[PDB]
Design a protein around this ligand. Structure first.
Ligand code: MG
Ligand code: MG
Ligand code: MG
Ligand code: ZN
Lengths: 1112, 227, 170, 94, 7, 333, 34
DNA sequence: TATAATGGGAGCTGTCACGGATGC
DNA sequence: GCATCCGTGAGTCGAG
């Protein structure tokens, strides 16, 4: 159908690759395509350069490294629960100094995981994503002292785990103090160690306001750098012998050692920019010609005194500024952990260098790769910043890869974060999305990267701007750091332009974030687009300008939760970003070059290009995602079809013809309905289920292991003791459920028998045995069964057996069987729906079509929304979307309305008129006039002041229709709704929160080991936690027996619960409860602390709750 | 797919001739309000009854005037005449004119109306007006048979020049209220339960009223017969 | 953590009386399960307890008579509905359960304000009082219709809001 | 709301004493199999089954409705516990 | 992520 | 017309007079007819249902004038930067108030049945400020520092915000969110501390026989210091209703006896008497003066506020108290 | 895990006994005999 | 069971808050 | 008597 796009804003540049930060970071770190000699010193190369050479005698040096090919492809790694990775080889050479012997060998360091094309990883068969970490950028900062108003604190910050933060402060007694590892000592001493003399400090700092004299100490200058050095070592190392070389080593390692101390390249640059100096290295000082030489400290102290005195050109720093904060991407974190593991490897190397045969040592004998591996794995498996990938829809993955976390190792602990850290900084413009952050505990600490935003090589986020010269807007684009942005007056993207020239006398612009009205002569730069201010998700919200930010947050967050539907459609009203999202997420399949399509199948698509080559693209079909959403590609092309470069070959999940489909376009009427839509609840039509709208496929994986035991082996078999053929009906010869079979709760997916524990039969069992004359079988039924509330059709079975080619399991396991069960979920009561504007609700009622409010022509609405949700939530974007949707319903078209530049009320009125001519004038030719009900409603509307009195019925109906309202007939009555109701097409998604995955109930079940309380969780078939607050509720109600019953009978009291259940099944009232087991646990644990806890009567005579079992 | 349906059973609960309750369950899903609404519309508008369509009183010019010797105004007397329940014993009789003449210290009731052939007053104890010493009340009231509710302006009938047009309430049914509750037959989940409540004036019993309402509807279904 | 308890997503019954709440059939079957076994043995549905339990184990083995038996079981009984966080005693209330198709718990509108619960996907937990004592406590003390006023302010905590006020004002 | 709950709250000095009384009476009825009821056959609480009306299985309903009649006597130290037990066992064997 | 259920 | 307050008073009065069963039936009835009538009322929300008053434009232009004046005053040195700032802020605040009043006056006079106006007035949904944001100007916005921008958002949500306006508002939005998330934890903590300190308090007896009591003042000093003025209704109600009189009180020829639980009507009577100048303070039995060990007595505690009658012995007062204080905690700004 | 000293667990209301008139009078005759 | 070998090694840092002692 | 150090706490479901 026709797609009408609005807006006058022309974007000069498109959006960059949205995954580019992940891909380019990891690629930069690896340098796998760069020949060994051409590799810059960065990433793992840098780690090798720091770790080597290793001395102490023998010397093990480093030449180059290489990454081999992955032993297994991505898919196969996903299936076999293997990590997708490449082997890392490193060429080393051992050199004995005296002998001169050189033994060179290539050593195998293990594997490193490789990033996939979409920017994610595969670890142990599970897709994972490394979230970027925002932190304080290294450098030199100056901040106002909270205690002392006229004094300032200098702070020298290196990279995380690169060595200590150093604090320079002017003490109340006048002396300048330095703080390292929580130790306060006069800076004078260190300055003497650096080789400074009283003369040099006097001439350098002299112009200052007597601040110099605080640095003046006669006892310090009376001694040479050596004595001062030993003095400093005695100050920083109490009890440690003040040996000369040990002091030199400690101080060098503290400051000058590049191996143990590293400023960032960004820290280096910023330090050079702030202090106005030049660094020969990333360290605060150097060891040169036997002594220490000062790189940094003196300019820092100089700047401190200069700021304190009030000397012009010296500023305090904003640590929340995005010029002072930087982003650590995948490559940097990976490089860090790699460097740690490599250091451990080095310790191992020197260790093995001390012990051994000194004559014969190969690099292989010295190198134990294990720690290195152990590091990398540890960073991928257990790290805070390594997250389980969200595969829910393509936008989920894309957004997940664009995450920015202030948390993590070396980052903010929670409740270390005040309002400042979580605040939206003025420099967040065009860089970090102000809209998208989680609600609750993570707010502001977890953010999303802006669409046009880019992270530079230093780790700072940069946003694009257009160069403006003399009122002319060039197509030249410049990406700026916040520090660079602060230097310019930057116009807004909506400022009127005739050609390339500014058409307004007064143009709205920003100076250091501050709003200001300026002349075209004053404008240096101009915004690229309103899109650059927000995250990709936020940019998917039409009429965003009409929605309150707090609701836009929810609308943004919930698109991530959108479940892919079989019938899923692109929104009627789009922001025009729907295609790029599908493209960059690698959801859909596209044509590599121009050519003709050869073969078309559900499984695969063969294409012949201009090269004459035949390329076959296999289609991913019904593959289970991380969240269990079905990911399947479907062919959008037919045999013989001519396709150009970039054309769409096949549609990915949640994609309609290349456009992002998060849900359905439904006809909604906004009215209160019988209290069924009360408080955000939603009422939907059965016709939605009839045509399979909001129907989604979900695949669950079940897994069972047969292992060797000391009591005899477990085995998967179709022979299960004490079971009828009826139960074994769908089981195959080997005991596994067949493909295509329907499974319900209680059914057996995989039959398994296990040898019983050693059994001493109770006399009852023996007597009953003699009565029925049947030998008690050797094994028992352990078979994996369908968990309560689950089920479906079995679409796959995997069987891995030990002793079979290409298959080796973990020790003791005989074999492993997996069963994949798919189910088709129709929308039901309790499922969660939401729109892009932040209006969310659970479906309360599904009415039959005849109960649904309908149009005069007989067309029933899909969804009934309550208007009460609108005013307090202040999101009007859904209203406008509804109106334009009403227009596009009868006009049979869809629209593109970009954010902040888009469809305006008058234009929508035009489109609604065009729509009305189709909706009404059709009726007039059909031989029907205005209905009586329409007349009544028109009277009501006349009194309402919606329509002008005196006009014909058609004119008034047109007036209502233009306001987006129509006459609506109640299904049950046939009488019209008294007022005209707003009706129109709205794009609504079914979120991942579904009543089926949630609803749970328990009579009795498994209990915890020590506490003997019921387990938590649904999969554990656990009970609901009754906590302190619930207990408070029961106490306030004054219900003693209910509460006591919860604490004892229901749980944690063994005799109590057994007796209670037995009594209930017997038809007897429950008995008197007894002492809860966890109290006994408390008593014994208190005894383990050597505290005697005695339960006494009123006679103060001991009462034994253990009943003599604990007393000798 | 394969469906079996037996029942409903029609249950009746009655208090005198003034009231009744009717319960029809189980019904197929949606049939609760499908039966309910039409009957309510028919019961209110289409049920035959009697009303006072005009009133003449001596010496009074119009409706907002007052009557010397009588404590109630012309307005109040008209209101009481609206609540008068008249029943026509003969199905042939379309309309009656009832005369009332009384004076002195007396309280006029519906009994005081001079009896007419085949005309029964259901509520003879209904109060019309109180007269004082010297008070004189002479009135002729027009009673017609019809349906629904007709304002005094719409019928516009006058026997004489001083005859006052009265809002005419024909419908013997005072109120109809129904409620549809979800009920279950065996494992059938969504089945509807219809409960009907009818208020009458006693001239026509609720059960009679309902049976007339379903007959009217059934008769309308036969109108689809011959194009 | 306690036995005889469950949870689900809440949906508003308009049709519920103030003392009532919709309880999904399966949830009730699991919550009342021992009582259901007893009632099943009392009638001709099962020979004994164990047979009845094995009968309820598989979903395809479940017939209509056990649902009616379940209806007989819960009669006159009440269950506790609780929404986290519980800020005050009204955070848990007693309702006479109404067996309903679907996996959602049905809540009465008027108590929502007391629970600070809405229909946007809030969930609630169900607890089953066992003893006649506990049941009596729930009915007399904890019944939703039995507390109409705020223990804090003395003002009504149960009262028209949203749609109700809208219609009445209209 | 429970039928005549206001009157039941009027009967006792503390709202909880009502609960204790109703609960204990319910336990009496359960133990003695309803044979000790003070309710006349017409006053019996009824449950609607598939077959027809039957005696209400709920002991608390019975207890409250009994308490509403005034046919029950409540208070502290009426008789000794074991004596009450043995007498109720004599009159209505379980 | 918490609050009233964006995430 | 029936709205939230009158309906609330209806529920309360019906509780008092007719009891909680009939009150419950009344509640269900109100629910039924409320929903039923709200269904067919015709209430909906269109974009034109948010009505921008003409007056607003005037109020903008006028503002733009006054600003200039202020600016002039800054040019010639009559106003310091901070003075200018404050004057601009005050100007925009008063302007905002004016456009609000314009919106609601336009609604009341011209479109009384307008959906936003209806929902606002009835108490169903919305307050004056939100409606003001929809129809009128969005208003002033705060910087991250808490400082306010000199430039307010002049756009409504109906007109839609400019990019810069939105970005300016995001600071306030984020601040509010973080405020919520951080508030929840401390509120909960406080609740638990209160629960822990008061948990042992229960009502253990009918009377502790204390002759001690407290005097709830019906009058309070005025910030003008001029004289004593009558306290607000709700406060006096908060310190009076349900409590037992510790001494005889004779006002307006009405005897309020010692030992009397004060009904709402009794409180209102006491207020009338206070206005008549007969009584400036009320002696009352208080938990503060209660001599009952490990708790309070019945006469000192007074009403069970849930049942609107004397508290039942055995009710746990401490927990109810702690919860009563703790629940609103998340609403404290 | 004991019975809390509040509400139904209060010593005040927890010792209350319930007896029907028939049983009460039987016990009354039992006391009347001795 | 025997050449002699003789004081370790990571630390990682943007809360606050009272409050309770301890120390100057 | 005041300055400063240390130890302890920091809201509930639900799933991981
Ligand atoms: Mg139905
Ligand atoms: Mg809410
Ligand atoms: Mg919610
Ligand atoms: Zn007291």
């Amino acid at each position: 159908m026709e797609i009408k796009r609005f807006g006058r804003i022309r974007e000069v540049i498109p959006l960059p690759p949205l995954t580019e930060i992940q891909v380019e970071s990891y690629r930069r770190a690896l340098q796998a395509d760069v020949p060994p000699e051409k590799r810059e010193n960065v990433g793992i190369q840098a780690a090798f350069r720091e770790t080597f050479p290793i001395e102490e005698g023998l010397v093990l040096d480093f030449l180059e490294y290489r990454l081999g090919e992955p032993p297994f492809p991505q898919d196969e790694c996903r299936e076999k629960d293997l990590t997708y990775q490449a082997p890392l080889y490193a060429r080393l050479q051992l050199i004995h100094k005296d002998t001169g012997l050189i033994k060179e060998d290539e050593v195998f360091l293990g594997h490193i995981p490789l990033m996939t094309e979409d920017g994610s990883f595969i670890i142990n068969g599970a897709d994972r994503v490394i979230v970027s970490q925002i932190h304080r950028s290294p450098g030199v900062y100056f901040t106002p002292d909270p205690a002392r108003p006229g004094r300032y604190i200098a702070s020298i910050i290196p990279l995380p785990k690169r060595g200590p933060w150093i604090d320079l402060e002017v003490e109340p007694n006048g002396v300048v103090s330095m703080k390292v590892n929580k130790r306060k000592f006069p800076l004078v001493l260190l300055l003497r160690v650096l080789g400074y003399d009283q003369e040099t400090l006097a001439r350098e700092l002299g112009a200052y306001g007597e601040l110099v004299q605080g640095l003046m100490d006669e006892s310090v200058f009376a001694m040479r750098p050596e004595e001062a050095l030993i003095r400093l070592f005695t100050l920083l190392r109490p009890g440690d012998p003040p040996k000369r070389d040990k002091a030199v080593a400690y101080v060098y390692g503290l400051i000058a050692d590049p191996r143990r101390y590293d400023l960032g390249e960004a820290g280096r640059y910023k330090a050079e920019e702030k202090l106005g100096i030049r660094l020969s290295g990333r360290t605060l000082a150097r060891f040169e010609d036997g002594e220490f030489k000062d790189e940094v400290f003196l300019p820092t102290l100089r700047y401190l005194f200069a700021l304190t005195a009030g000397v012009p050109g010296h500023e305090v720093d904003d640590i929340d500024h995005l010029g002072n904060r930087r982003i650590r991407t995948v490559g940097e974190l990976m490089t860090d952990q790699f460097r740690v593991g490599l250091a451990r490897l080095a310790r191992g190397v020197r260790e093995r260098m001390l012990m051994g045969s000194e004559d014969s040592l190969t690099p292989a004998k010295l190198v134990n790769s294990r720690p290195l591996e152990a590091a990398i794995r540890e960073f991928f498996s257990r790290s805070q910043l390594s997250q389980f990938k969200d595969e829910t829809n393509p936008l989920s993955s894309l957004r997940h890869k664009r995450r920015i976390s202030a948390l993590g190792p070396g980052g903010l602990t929670r409740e270390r974060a005040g309002f400042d850290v979580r605040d939206v900084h003025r420099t967040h413009y065009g860089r970090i999305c102000p809209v998208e952050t989680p609600e609750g505990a993570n707010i502001g600490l977890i953010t999303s990267l802006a669409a046009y935003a880019r992270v530079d090589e230093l780790g700072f986020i940069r946003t694009p701007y257009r160069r403006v010269v003399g009122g002319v807007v060039t197509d030249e684009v410049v990406y700026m750091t916040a520090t660079e942005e602060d230097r310019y007056t930057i116009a807004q993207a909506n400022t009127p332009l005739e050609g390339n020239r500014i058409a307004a006398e007064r143009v709205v612009a920003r100076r250091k974030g501050e709003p200001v009205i300026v002349s075209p002569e004053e404008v240096e730069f101009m915004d690229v687009s309103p899109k650059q201010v927000f995250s990709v998700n936020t940019n998917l919200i039409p009429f965003l300008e009409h929605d309150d930010a707090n609701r836009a947050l929810m609308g943004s967050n919930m698109q991530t939760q959108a479940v892919p539907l079989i019938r899923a459609q692109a929104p009627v009203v789009m922001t025009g970003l729907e295609e790029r999202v599908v493209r960059d997420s690698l959801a859909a399949l596209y044509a590599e070059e121009d050519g003709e399509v050869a073969k078309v199948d559900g499984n695969r698509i063969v294409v012949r290009y201009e090269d004459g080559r035949l390329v076959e693209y296999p289609l991913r079909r019904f593959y289970r995602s991380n969240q269990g959403t079905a990911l399947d590609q479907r062919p959008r092309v037919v045999v013989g079809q001519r396709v150009r470069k970039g054309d769409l070959l096949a549609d990915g999940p949640a994609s309609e013809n290349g456009f992002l489909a998060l849900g359905q376009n439904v006809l909604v009427a906004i009215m209160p309905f019988d209290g069924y839509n009360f408080e955000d609840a939603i009422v939907i039509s059965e016709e939605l289920l009839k045509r399979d709208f909001y129907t989604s496929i979900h695949i669950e994986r079940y897994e069972i292991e047969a292992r060797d035991t000391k009591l005899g082996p477990e085995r998967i078999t179709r022979d299960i003791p004490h079971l009828s053929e009826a139960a074994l009906r769908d089981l195959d010869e080997e005991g596994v459920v067949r493909i295509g079979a329907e499974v319900k709760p209680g059914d057996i997916l995989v039959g398994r028998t296990s040898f019983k524990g050693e059994s001493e039969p109770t006399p009852e069992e023996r007597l009953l045995r003699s009565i029925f004359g049947e030998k008690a079988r050797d094994v028992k039924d352990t078979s994996l069964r369908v968990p309560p509330g689950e089920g479906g059709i079995v679409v796959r079975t995997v069987r891995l057996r030990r002793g079979d080619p290409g298959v080796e399991l973990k020790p003791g396991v005989r074999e492993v069987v997996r069963v994949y069960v798919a189910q088709k979920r129709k929308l039901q009561v309790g499922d969660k729906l939401a729109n892009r504007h932040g209006n969310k609700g659970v479906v309360a009622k599904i009415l039959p079509v005849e109960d649904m409010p309908h149009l005069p022509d007989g067309t029933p609405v899909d969804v009934i929304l309550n208007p009460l949700g609108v005013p307090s939530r202040m999101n009007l974007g859904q209203i406008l979307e509804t109106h334009l949707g009403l227009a596009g319903y009868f006009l049979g078209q869809r629209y593109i309305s970009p954010i902040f530049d888009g469809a305006k009320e008058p234009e929508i009125k035009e489109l609604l008129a065009q729509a009305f001519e189709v909706y009404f004038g059709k009726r007039k030719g059909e031989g029907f006039g205005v209905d009586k009900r329409e007349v009544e409603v028109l009277r009501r509307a006349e009194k309402l002041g919606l329509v002008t009195p005196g006009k014909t019925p058609e004119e008034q109906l047109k007036e209502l229709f233009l306001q987006g309202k129509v006459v609506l007939y109640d299904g049950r009555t046939g009488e019209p709704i008294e007022g005209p109701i707003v009706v129109g097409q709205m794009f609504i998604m079914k979120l991942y929160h579904m009543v089926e995955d949630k609803m749970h109930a328990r009579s009795t079940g498994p209990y915890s080991l020590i506490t003997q309380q019921p387990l938590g969780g649904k999969a554990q078939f656990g009970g609901q936690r009754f906590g302190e607050m619930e207990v408070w509720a029961l106490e306030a109600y004054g219900a003693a027996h209910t509460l006591q019953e919860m604490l004892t009978l229901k749980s944690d009291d063994i005799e109590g619960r057994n007796a209670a259940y037995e009594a209930i099944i017997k038809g007897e009232d429950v008995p008197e409860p007894s002492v809860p087991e966890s109290f006994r646990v408390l008593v014994k644990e208190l005894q383990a602390l050597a505290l005697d806890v005695q339960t006494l009567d009123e006679k103060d005579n001991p009462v034994d709750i253990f009943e003599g079992l604990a007393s000798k | 797919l394969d469906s079996k349906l037996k029942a409903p059973v029609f249950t009746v609960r009655t208090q005198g001739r003034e009231y009744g309750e009717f319960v029809l369950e189980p019904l197929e899903r949606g049939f609760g309000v499908t039966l309910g609404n039409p009957l309510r519309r028919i019961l209110l508008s289409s049920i035959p009854g009697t009303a006072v369509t005009s009133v003449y009183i001596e010496d009074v010019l119009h409706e907002f005037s007052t009557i010397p010797g009588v404590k109630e105004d012309v307005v109040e007397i008209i209101l009481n005449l609206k609540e008068l329940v008249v029943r026509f014993l003969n199905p042939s009789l379309q309309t009656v004119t009832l005369l009332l003449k009384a004076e002195g210290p007396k309280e006029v009731k519906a009994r005081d109306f001079l009896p007419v052939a085949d005309v029964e007053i259901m509520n003879p104890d209904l109060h019309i007006a109180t007269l004082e010493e010297g008070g004189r009340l002479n009135m002729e009231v027009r009673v017609d048979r019809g349906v629904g509710y007709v304002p005094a302006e719409k019928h516009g009938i006058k026997d004489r020049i001083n005859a006052i047009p009265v809002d005419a309430v024909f419908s013997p049914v005072r109120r109809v209220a129904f409620q549809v509750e979800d009920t279950r037959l065996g494992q059938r989940t969504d089945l509807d339960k219809l409960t009907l409540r009818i208020w009458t004036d006693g001239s026509v019993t609720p059960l009679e009223a309902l049976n007339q309402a379903v007959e009217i509807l059934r008769e309308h279904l036969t109108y689809f017969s011959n194009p | 953590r306690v036995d005889y308890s469950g949870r689900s997503v809440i949906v508003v019954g308009p049709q519920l009386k103030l003392h009532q709440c919709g309880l999904p059939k399966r949830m009730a079957l699991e919550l009342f399960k021992p009582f259901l076994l007893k009632k099943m043995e009392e009638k001709g549905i099962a020979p004994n307890v164990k047979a009845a339990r094995r009968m309820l184990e598989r979903q395809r083995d479940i017939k209509d008579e056990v649902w009616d038996a379940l209806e007989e079981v819960i009669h006159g009984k009440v269950v506790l509905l609780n929404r986290a966080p519980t800020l005050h005693r009204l955070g848990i209330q007693a309702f006479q359960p109404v067996l309903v198709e679907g996996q959602s718990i049905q809540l009465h509108p008027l108590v929502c304000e007391a629970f600070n619960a809405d229909f946007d996907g809030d969930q609630m937990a169900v607890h089953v009082p066992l003893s006649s004592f506990a049941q009596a406590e729930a009915r007399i003390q904890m019944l939703s219709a039995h507390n109409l006023l705020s223990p804090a302010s003395g003002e009504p905590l149960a009262k028209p809001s949203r749609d109700i006020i809208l219609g009445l004002y209209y | 709301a429970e039928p005549g709950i206001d009157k039941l709250f009027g009967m006792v000095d503390s709202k909880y004493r009502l609960t204790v009384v109703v609960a204990k009476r319910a336990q009496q009825l359960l133990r003695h199999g309803f044979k000790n009821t003070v309710l006349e056959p017409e006053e019996r609480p009824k449950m609607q089954t598939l077959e027809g009306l039957f005696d209400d299985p709920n002991a608390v309903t019975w207890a409250m409705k009994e308490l509403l009649t005034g046919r029950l006597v409540f208070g502290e130290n009426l008789v000794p516990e074991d004596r009450l037990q043995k007498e109720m066992e004599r009159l209505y064997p379980v | 992520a918490x609050x009233x259920x964006x995430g | 017309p029936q709205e939230k307050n009158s309906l609330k008073d209806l529920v309360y009065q019906a509780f008092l007079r007719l009891g909680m069963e009939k009150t419950a039936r009344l509640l269900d009835a109100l629910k039924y007819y409320g929903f039923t009538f709200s269904t067919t009322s015709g209430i909906t929300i269109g974009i034109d249902d948010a009505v921008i008053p003409e007056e607003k434009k005037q109020y903008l232009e006028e503002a733009d004038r006054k600003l200039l004046q202020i600016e002039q005053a800054y040019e010639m040195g009559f106003l310091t930067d901070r003075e200018r700032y404050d004057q601009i802020l005050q100007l925009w605040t008063e302007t905002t108030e004016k456009v609000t009043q314009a919106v609601f006056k336009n609604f009341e006079e011209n479109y009384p049945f307008n959906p936003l106006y209806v929902m606002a007035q009835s108490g169903a949904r919305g307050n004056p400020q939100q409606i003001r944001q929809l129809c009128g100007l969005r208003g002033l916005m705060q910087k991250p520092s808490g400082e306010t921008f000199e430039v307010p958002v002049r756009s409504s949500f109906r007109e839609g915000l400019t990019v810069l306006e939105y970005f300016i508002s995001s600071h306030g939005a984020r601040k509010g969110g973080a405020d919520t998330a951080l508030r929840t934890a401390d509120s909960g903590y406080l609740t638990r501390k209160l629960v822990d300190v008061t948990h042992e308090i229960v009502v253990r007896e009918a009377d502790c026989g204390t002759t001690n009591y407290i005097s709830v003042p019906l009058f309070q000093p005025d910030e003008v210091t001029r004289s004593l003025r009558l306290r607000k209704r709700a406060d006096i109600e908060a310190g009076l209703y349900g409590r037992v009189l510790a001494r005889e009180v004779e006002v307006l020829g009405v005897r309020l006896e010692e030992g009397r639980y004060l009904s709402m009507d009794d409180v209102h009577l006491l207020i009338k008497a206070a206005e008549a100048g007969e009584i400036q303070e009320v002696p009352v039995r208080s938990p503060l003066t209660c001599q009952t060990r490990y708790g309070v007595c019945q006469k000192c505690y007074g009403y069970d506020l849930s049942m609107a009658r004397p508290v039942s012995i055995g009710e746990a007062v401490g927990i109810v108290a702690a919860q009563s204080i703790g629940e609103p905690g998340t609403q404290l700004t | 895990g004991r019975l809390i000293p509040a509400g139904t667990g209060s010593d005040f209301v927890r010792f209350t006994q319930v007896v029907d008139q028939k049983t009460l009078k039987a016990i009354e005759e039992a006391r009347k005999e001795a």
